[PDB]
Design an enzyme around this catalytic site. Structure first.
Site, PDB file in Angstrom:
ATOM      1  N   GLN B  37       1.023  -1.276  -0.015  1.00  0.00           N
ATOM      2  CA  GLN B  37      -0.012   0.094  -0.133  1.00  0.00           C
ATOM      3  C   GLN B  37       0.992   1.238   0.042  1.00  0.00           C
ATOM      4  O   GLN B  37       0.453   2.256  -0.673  1.00  0.00           O
ATOM      5  CB  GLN B  37      -1.020  -0.017   1.321  1.00  0.00           C
ATOM      6  CG  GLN B  37      -1.934   1.251   1.414  1.00  0.00           C
ATOM      7  CD  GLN B  37      -3.266   1.209   0.475  1.00  0.00           C
ATOM      8  OE1 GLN B  37      -3.332  -0.007  -0.161  1.00  0.00           O
ATOM      9  NE2 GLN B  37      -3.900   2.267   0.441  1.00  0.00           N
ATOM     10  N   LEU B  38       1.856   1.379   1.024  1.00  0.00           N
ATOM     11  CA  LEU B  38       2.565   2.514   0.933  1.00  0.00           C
ATOM     12  C   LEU B  38       4.077   2.183   0.377  1.00  0.00           C
ATOM     13  O   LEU B  38       4.930   3.339   0.689  1.00  0.00           O
ATOM     14  CB  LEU B  38       2.661   2.732   2.499  1.00  0.00           C
ATOM     15  CG  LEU B  38       1.342   2.828   3.203  1.00  0.00           C
ATOM     16  CD1 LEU B  38       1.492   3.470   4.577  1.00  0.00           C
ATOM     17  CD2 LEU B  38       0.336   4.146   2.432  1.00  0.00           C
ATOM     18  N   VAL B  44      10.546   2.504   6.467  1.00  0.00           N
ATOM     19  CA  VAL B  44      10.741   3.460   7.329  1.00  0.00           C
ATOM     20  C   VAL B  44       9.610   3.256   8.464  1.00  0.00           C
ATOM     21  O   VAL B  44      10.038   3.628   9.764  1.00  0.00           O
ATOM     22  CB  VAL B  44      10.310   4.817   7.005  1.00  0.00           C
ATOM     23  CG1 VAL B  44      10.510   5.887   7.865  1.00  0.00           C
ATOM     24  CG2 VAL B  44      11.291   5.324   5.770  1.00  0.00           C
ATOM     25  N   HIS B  98      -2.993  -0.415  -9.736  1.00  0.00           N
ATOM     26  CA  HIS B  98      -1.639  -0.075  -9.364  1.00  0.00           C
ATOM     27  C   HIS B  98      -0.466  -1.165  -9.525  1.00  0.00           C
ATOM     28  O   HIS B  98      -0.741  -2.207  -9.495  1.00  0.00           O
ATOM     29  CB  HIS B  98      -1.886   0.091  -7.746  1.00  0.00           C
ATOM     30  CG  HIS B  98      -2.360   1.217  -7.144  1.00  0.00           C
ATOM     31  ND1 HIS B  98      -1.746   2.269  -7.062  1.00  0.00           N
ATOM     32  CD2 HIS B  98      -3.684   1.651  -6.572  1.00  0.00           C
ATOM     33  CE1 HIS B  98      -2.411   3.371  -6.488  1.00  0.00           C
ATOM     34  NE2 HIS B  98      -3.544   3.018  -6.418  1.00  0.00           N
ATOM     35  N   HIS B 121      -3.117   5.449 -12.398  1.00  0.00           N
ATOM     36  CA  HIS B 121      -3.684   3.985 -11.829  1.00  0.00           C
ATOM     37  C   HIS B 121      -5.093   3.975 -12.113  1.00  0.00           C
ATOM     38  O   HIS B 121      -5.860   2.624 -11.885  1.00  0.00           O
ATOM     39  CB  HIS B 121      -3.342   3.822 -10.482  1.00  0.00           C
ATOM     40  CG  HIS B 121      -3.910   5.061  -9.487  1.00  0.00           C
ATOM     41  ND1 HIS B 121      -3.642   6.023  -8.854  1.00  0.00           N
ATOM     42  CD2 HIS B 121      -5.374   4.858  -8.930  1.00  0.00           C
ATOM     43  CE1 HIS B 121      -4.617   6.757  -8.242  1.00  0.00           C
ATOM     44  NE2 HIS B 121      -5.585   5.937  -8.306  1.00  0.00           N
ATOM     45  N   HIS B 258       7.294  11.167   3.937  1.00  0.00           N
ATOM     46  CA  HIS B 258       8.615  11.069   4.782  1.00  0.00           C
ATOM     47  C   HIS B 258       9.857  11.118   3.728  1.00  0.00           C
ATOM     48  O   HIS B 258       9.764  10.463   2.896  1.00  0.00           O
ATOM     49  CB  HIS B 258       8.665   9.859   5.617  1.00  0.00           C
ATOM     50  CG  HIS B 258       9.588   9.810   6.558  1.00  0.00           C
ATOM     51  ND1 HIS B 258      10.964   9.149   6.440  1.00  0.00           N
ATOM     52  CD2 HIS B 258       9.682   9.993   7.844  1.00  0.00           C
ATOM     53  CE1 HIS B 258      11.640   9.251   7.548  1.00  0.00           C
ATOM     54  NE2 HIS B 258      10.872  10.075   8.376  1.00  0.00           N
TER      55      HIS B 258
HETATM   56  N1  DTP Z   1       5.542  12.739  12.731  1.00  0.00           N
HETATM   57  C1  DTP Z   1       5.393  11.359  13.158  1.00  0.00           C
HETATM   58  N2  DTP Z   1       4.438  10.682  13.907  1.00  0.00           N
HETATM   59  C2  DTP Z   1       4.848   9.430  14.304  1.00  0.00           C
HETATM   60  N3  DTP Z   1       5.711   8.899  13.775  1.00  0.00           N
HETATM   61  C3  DTP Z   1       6.765   9.495  12.806  1.00  0.00           C
HETATM   62  C4  DTP Z   1       6.579  10.790  12.619  1.00  0.00           C
HETATM   63  N4  DTP Z   1       7.880  10.727  11.699  1.00  0.00           N
HETATM   64  C5  DTP Z   1       8.399   9.761  11.464  1.00  0.00           C
HETATM   65  N5  DTP Z   1       7.866   8.717  12.242  1.00  0.00           N
HETATM   66  C6  DTP Z   1       8.373   7.388  12.702  1.00  0.00           C
HETATM   67  C7  DTP Z   1       8.929   6.860  11.350  1.00  0.00           C
HETATM   68  C8  DTP Z   1       9.983   5.928  11.775  1.00  0.00           C
HETATM   69  O1  DTP Z   1       9.517   4.743  12.097  1.00  0.00           O
HETATM   70  C9  DTP Z   1      10.086   6.531  13.204  1.00  0.00           C
HETATM   71  C10 DTP Z   1      11.496   7.446  13.052  1.00  0.00           C
HETATM   72  O2  DTP Z   1      11.241   8.609  12.226  1.00  0.00           O
HETATM   73  P1  DTP Z   1      12.088   9.746  12.076  1.00  0.00           P
HETATM   74  O3  DTP Z   1      12.253  10.645  13.309  1.00  0.00           O
HETATM   75  O4  DTP Z   1      11.604  10.733  10.798  1.00  0.00           O
HETATM   76  O5  DTP Z   1      13.410   9.329  11.677  1.00  0.00           O
HETATM   77  P2  DTP Z   1      14.804   9.751  10.690  1.00  0.00           P
HETATM   78  O6  DTP Z   1      15.927   8.902  10.699  1.00  0.00           O
HETATM   79  O7  DTP Z   1      14.193   9.801   9.302  1.00  0.00           O
HETATM   80  O8  DTP Z   1      15.185  11.460  10.938  1.00  0.00           O
HETATM   81  P3  DTP Z   1      16.527  11.743  11.669  1.00  0.00           P
HETATM   82  O9  DTP Z   1      17.451  10.887  11.235  1.00  0.00           O
HETATM   83  O10 DTP Z   1      16.950  13.139  10.943  1.00  0.00           O
HETATM   84  O11 DTP Z   1      16.260  11.975  13.162  1.00  0.00           O
HETATM   85  O12 DTP Z   1       9.105   7.424  13.662  1.00  0.00           O
END
Ligand code: DTP
Ligand code: DTP
Ligand code: DTP
Ligand code: DTP
Ligand code: MG
Ligand code: MG
Ligand code: MG
Ligand code: MG
EC number: 3.1.5.-
Lengths: 481, 481, 481, 481
Positions: B37-38, B44, B98, B121, B258
């Site tokens: 889906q994503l 991540v 898709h 799609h 992201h």
């Molecule tokens: N706004 C959010 N709310 C909830 N979960 C999030 C959010 N953003 C990212 N995540 C999740 C995705 C990942 O599984 C985990 C870590 O995200 P994130 O903080 O973006 O790590 P990152 O490695 O991309 O940033 P960085 O290296 O700059 O610290 O949290």
């Protein structure tokens, strides 16, 4: 390198130590992204798409949680960060050895393709772990964070599979015996692996979980038990522990042993059997391997995932056609038809040597009803399922140490009669499911007659739909009444 | 045949009509089990393992829910079982088109691999629906359950993709216009597809949803608007609708857009491009196709899923090594490094003809700081993201019809100032992310200087970490501080 | 008057028919906002703040759900909108008769303050329902919505309390027998009341259950049994049913029978008893009533809620202080101290006639340990709790009718040996809790010696902490050792 | 004695330090069990039965969580167990000062009964805390666990209300300034109190929460800004923070400012006012106090809870009849009728001195509709609600300090323009709701004509149902069209 934070739907935001990160970011670990936790379960429970990867993350997380809690409430144990890291690594890595569709691979496929070997996902996990360590230069990283590779690698492997061959472990002494009870608990089966798959499987299946592992962690201590240091649970939580195994059993009844899920595991396994001579995975040095032999070279095993399914599915090579059509029959949902379920009575137990003799017994079964089409041994499938509390005929709670509010480091034992009389009297049983591989209306009728008759003659339990599916057979002598 | 019950973690026990089941039990539909889906989001968010299959089931179910509710509260609409079935089928099938890793394929890969062509799609879904119907003899099954294949197939396709080109639809008359607002709402973007992926994506990501679709359904009516019968929402629910789009925006900010997830989508896409000449997919009558040309034959597209990734990963063929190598660097987590984010200011907007023009722009700017390394166009990646409320610069709530408690059959309109002054003033913006393909410390320092300088030269917004990563560049810019 | 939509955390948005609305908006129904579902449970589980009001709404909702589902799957049952409304009203109103702190009142208080009368919350519900109807002019509204008041009121009351006086019901004929199985199922205990309080209590307690009522509703049918039309469950769902009762038992172990929750119910009851001569409640014509006698006039009972607690707490009059002081010892958390738990071991059971003789026996046991205080009966409290599957010693599943996939209209029975051998062998047991009303260290030590000795003398089960709290007493009997 | 474990539905199993337990087990704290968190909200959202007690436990828990996390990621801050305990205590106790039905009391009742005074629930919290300390002899207990009562009690009170009056706090030095940002954040409003009521209120309302406080805690640090040590958030989390306040606003729109909930608060308040002469509450040393004067003696305020409602409801004294019938009109659901909502346009804002003159403005308006019933000032209620982001006209995110991953310890600011163009442009607005105390059809019609005319005359926004409820008035106004 710094700590990473990862967001898991089950546990929330998990902190991963840089060493754990370097272990995770390898082909050997990332492999688990392509192996379904519940395998063919996904073809029955559409939410069950989760893989062994995220499960492994959860197990490592919870291992860390428990060791840390024990360490913080009882400082006299001298649990070191090194211990914490090793327990986390063992938690992270104890699923490394699973193959395509998880348990289907070691529980169904390998026993049929290579009856020779004694293979388990545990051994696969130690081998794959060794392979990961060696192929990815993790030993100097381990050293970098204060681990001693020759002692600690042994500790981790011992956590995953038990003694590698009267204190049998060489990774850690008896005063840290409790550390061996966290990741894979060989003494009573209460470990963090169960806790994660309870929460996660329930999250994805659409079944809700009633075991509170956080509570257990809160009430857990370390006690002296026969000169060993073991994990003790608070006495009054004993009920919860029974419920835990109940939960486990329930999850097997509802999901893991679902009749259709199981027959799909069977069909997939059969397709793998018809593909085992023509599908090849190239291993170390360039040497070539097959699905059934991939387990002999970890470099080959690394590339053995659920993908094989699609490989068999998308293939054009004629030599694979017998396999390829089976999978297609799964896609069209033309599955082997379920006939019924029964159980042994009294003291009768079904041995694993006698399984192949079971369809043939059913095919033999005596007529009584006016005959039409007649089916043979190959047309019947008989699946025998062992339902237990994780320790054969034994009550695992008899192997749990408890402590009381009045004397928190005095270990005690608790018998079943001290808890409840509404508890089970037995802790092991067998279920026998019978399916028919021909699917037309009267082949199904015939198969039902054969099956109920066979149940009557071996004096098995009366099938629940017996009176309906075989009204002419169930009247035969009456201790089914 | 009879009804099937399916247990979904999001919606609970769903009833599937035998016709829906026969549509589902085809390779064309079952294909969706193998498309994430994503997509790269799974790399991540470890919980994001769900596939397009279960989402499709959910969309079909919710479509049924809404059409049934409208039909039950307003009999004068004369909604037929046939209408309900067509809406359910359209709901089930609008995701058929898709490709591998979903939006990565139609949003990134095809636009670079096939920039001539117009591909969506939606169109893919219509084509694949046609192929499903024809390859599986579904028309007689449709007739068996009271459908008229020639009008109804048209109706379903129109629900998925819109008017095939007054009243532009041929599937249903204007007095049932509201039926076209359920599965894919071209008029304001409020449809059941959104509701399902809100709930499901949130369930699996570990992020939580604040939109109550059930409430909306409860308050939904049909009223007359410009000689059509359309869906109206109760007036006081307008706030919720604003929140809905806010939710959507939020979900794009946290997960779907992201930074790292997008860079992984990008790397996978590039690998697919570098593999596109050597990967073969067998289509109709035996003709062979490439990843980028699989979209021209639905029999080939049927076997184009996420699996292609693993093929590229597991290959031994030297002609694939440049592709394969990229994927392996994903496994080792050696990703293109994120340099920063910025936004255009004023009225400036970046069109897709200017996308390819962006790395060359970033490399040409030079900051008054002594560097070390000098970087080229190829070393930069510039990703442009359009964030809006689904109708570009427009407010979608201006295209919603409402009704009041005192006169429930009179549609009315509601403006932004009648709701809140705390609402967004614009409804579209663009995000510009810049990454560097060299990962060493110093290429990274250089890249940060190039990037912040470039932001200054185009008068973009100040990167949030601007003062820290480039202290010598940021003061020389007075439209900031 | 229109349908009202109400948002419940458990069931979501529920639609309330204007007649139901008129019944709810009376002092007799609104009364239930001031009676906590789990009473003193709130003083152990701080989340358990919920009241009988929201619970009643939930029961009415689910009653409607089940009757509507049955009616829609089997039109041949001739279920009318009138039937649906009566079942909903019965669901809504079967909790009307509960008194202060719910089960504390009819289970503990009334049996002690007024042992003469046979009082239940059910009869209270019939009485209060009559009073609601008559005091609020609901009969003409009932007629206004197509109900026939004197047959239907009878039907509702019969649903709540059972036969009011062979076919024992006069509200509905045998071909509508299934309607009596929804709100309060007197034949096997499977009804929608259980379903609501499972989900709701779990929601607030912070403990969780795995029973899926929605699934059950999906698989429910009506079949002919002996001479009635009764609800049938699908055969393979039998396991779930066992789990259902297991859930109930679990919920009693963890929360409803919590040792401290129970001792707090006991203390509140005693305060109410010592207050039962001075608190005065205004009745019918101005006649005045008291807590134990309020049940004789519904106008007074209407004004009898949990409020009484605080009134007793806030009072100043000296004749109430022995009462008011009890409550304050609850506030300071100076509770009766828990001494221990035990059970009988044979088939003879502690009869309800022997409770008062139980503290005195504890005083009678002679422990050969030197004590410093010695206590007589007044210092001991002995609480005996009957844990069962809702039907004495019987298996309720033996009273469930099932149907098979092949013949959905033929009811069948399923025995315990036909499901699993891991099930309970008995379905009833007793728990014996002992507390001490003097709380200093030495009365507690002494009380523990007395208690363990008493356990020894009567051959009850070994207290789990036996060896710890009384090590000098426990060796005396070789079967603990 | 020792630690207690308590199970909360929101946070799970919470550990309570013995000192916290002794603070909790007092009449002053236990009082909070009888004060509903959302007051009259329970009469609209039936799940909202939760009280200030459990909320207080949650706030203490989260305060502890944050201070612990900060202490463990940055040992150099020298956070002591003493600091943790003081912060936990402040968290536990910042709700002590709420009165009957929470915000109804300090937001509606007291401002009308005593417009004189400067009263807030904060000041009440300090006074009640002092009274708890002194009345329960907890100071020697504080000393027993290593606290210094003079500085630590000062510190706690300052946490609840701010400086009791350079560095304005005397409880802790500037190097511990960040500790003042945890329980009540006077600088930007981001504190643990909000996090708990987001989670709990959403749990009970049936609305779902979209803020991840655990994530925030994980990304929280302490940085130097303006020679002070403040809590800093990670830069990229800024979006989340905006969402947080959005959430708050949303929760106010859906639940806390629900039109009917607010009118029920208003009616309860009026009942309190008309009862304000006849209920008597005994204060310090038999001195007697009033509902409006209970706030001047903490011994009296201790006995002032939601119970007051029921007292008024159950009373027989004729002097209370005016109060008593009002409450009864709530029970019969005979509520003041909601007429409509509107807001000021441009920049004109309504001051609190002009609140009292507004119903007369509505009654004075002359709408050109034929009427026979005409209403006067006393028949109208005009409720003015201030919706903001917690800092009046200010953007609270402008008062948040951030840090970047490259320099996790160098504080920075982020402006709205660096985040999104889709964000709010204003951070404060007012809602004007109009109700009518006569509930008949023609009075409601008239009231609507008066209301829409009044809106036209003040150049306010067009009521959403304007064209429907007053079709003869709204065309007169061409800034409405
Ligand atoms: N706004 C959010 N709310 C909830 N979960 C999030 C959010 N953003 C990212 N995540 C999740 C995705 C990942 O599984 C985990 C870590 O995200 P994130 O903080 O973006 O790590 P990152 O490695 O991309 O940033 P960085 O290296 O700059 O610290 O949290
Ligand atoms: N005990 C259970 N609890 C919750 N969900 C279940 C349970 N058993 C099965 N499910 C799920 C799995 C499937 O997604 C869906 C269908 O279940 P199931 O009743 O087993 O269908 P089935 O096709 O195998 O039975 P049958 O064909 O005999 O009617 O419900
Ligand atoms: N935005 C919301 N989201 C979720 N639940 C809500 C929301 N607003 C109100 N509720 C709840 C509270 C009630 O329990 C139920 C009904 O509220 P609501 O629809 O506002 O009834 P109402 O009677 O006040 O409006 P009206 O009479 O105009 O239809 O839904
Ligand atoms: N089996 C259970 N599962 C989940 N929560 C429980 C369970 N039993 C009790 N709780 C809850 C209720 C309380 O809020 C909290 C504490 O329970 P509990 O451990 O029984 O306290 P307690 O004070 O009675 O035990 P102790 O004997 O140690 O003093 O946990
Ligand atoms: Mg990172
Ligand atoms: Mg089936
Ligand atoms: Mg209303
Ligand atoms: Mg305790």
């Amino acid at each position: 390198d710094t700590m990473k934070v990862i967001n898991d739907p089950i546990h929330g935001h998990i902190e991963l130590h840089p060493l754990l990160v370097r272990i995770i970011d390898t082909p050997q670990f990332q492999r688990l992204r392509y192996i379904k936790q519940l395998g063919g379960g996904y073809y029955v429970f559409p939410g069950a798409s989760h893989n062994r990867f995220e499960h492994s993350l959860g197990v490592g997380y919870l291992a860390g949680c428990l060791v840390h809690a024990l360490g913080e409430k009882q400082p006299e144990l001298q649990i070191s960060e090194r211990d914490v890291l090793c327990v986390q690594i063992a938690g992270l890595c104890r699923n490394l050895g699973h193959g395509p569709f998880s348990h289907m691979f070691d529980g169904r496929f390998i026993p049929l393709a290579r009856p020779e070997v004694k293979w388990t996902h545990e051994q696969g996990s130690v081998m794959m772990f060794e392979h990961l360590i060696n192929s990815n230069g993790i030993k100097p990283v381990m050293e970098q964070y204060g681990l001693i590779p020759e002692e600690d690698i042994c500790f981790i492997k011992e956590q995953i599979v038990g003694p590698l061959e009267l204190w049998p472990y060489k990774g850690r002494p008896e005063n840290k015996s409790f550390l061996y009870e966290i990741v894979s608990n060989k003494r009573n089966g209460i470990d963090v692996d169960k806790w994660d798959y309870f929460a996660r499987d329930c999250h994805h299946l659409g079944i809700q979980n009633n075991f509170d592992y956080k509570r257990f962690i809160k009430f857990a201590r370390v006690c002296e038990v026969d000169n060993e240091l073991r994990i003790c649970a608070r006495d009054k939580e004993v009920g919860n522990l029974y419920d835990m195994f109940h939960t486990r059993n329930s999850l097997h009844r509802r999901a893991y042993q679902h009749k259709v899920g199981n027959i799909i595991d069977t069909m997939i396994t059969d397709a793998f059997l018809k593909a085992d001579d023509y599908i090849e995975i190239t291993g170390a040095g360039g040497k070539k391997y097959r699905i059934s032999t991939a387990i002999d070279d970890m470099e080959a095993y690394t590339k053995l995932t659920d993908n094989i399914f699609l490989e068999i599915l998308y293939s054009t090579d004629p030599k694979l056609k017998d396999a390829r059509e089976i999978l297609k029959q799964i896609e069209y949902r033309n599955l082997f038809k379920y006939v019924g379920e029964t159980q042994p009575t009294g003291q009768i137990k079904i041995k694993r040597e006698d399984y192949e003799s079971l369809p043939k017994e059913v095919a033999s079964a005596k007529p009584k009803v006016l005959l039409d089409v007649k089916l043979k041994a190959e047309d019947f499938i008989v699946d025998v399922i062992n339902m237990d509390y994780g320790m054969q005929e034994k009550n695992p709670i008899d192997h749990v140490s408890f402590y009381c509010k009045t004397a928190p480091n005095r270990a005690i034992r608790i018998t079943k009669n001290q808890v409840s009389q509404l508890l089970p009297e037995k802790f092991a049983e067998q279920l026998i499911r019978v399916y028919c591989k021909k699917v037309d209306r009267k082949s199904l009728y015939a198969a039902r007659q054969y099956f109920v008759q066979w149940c009557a003659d071996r004096n098995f339990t009366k099938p629940q739909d017996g009176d309906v599916i075989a009204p002419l057979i169930t009247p035969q002598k009456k201790e089914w009444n």
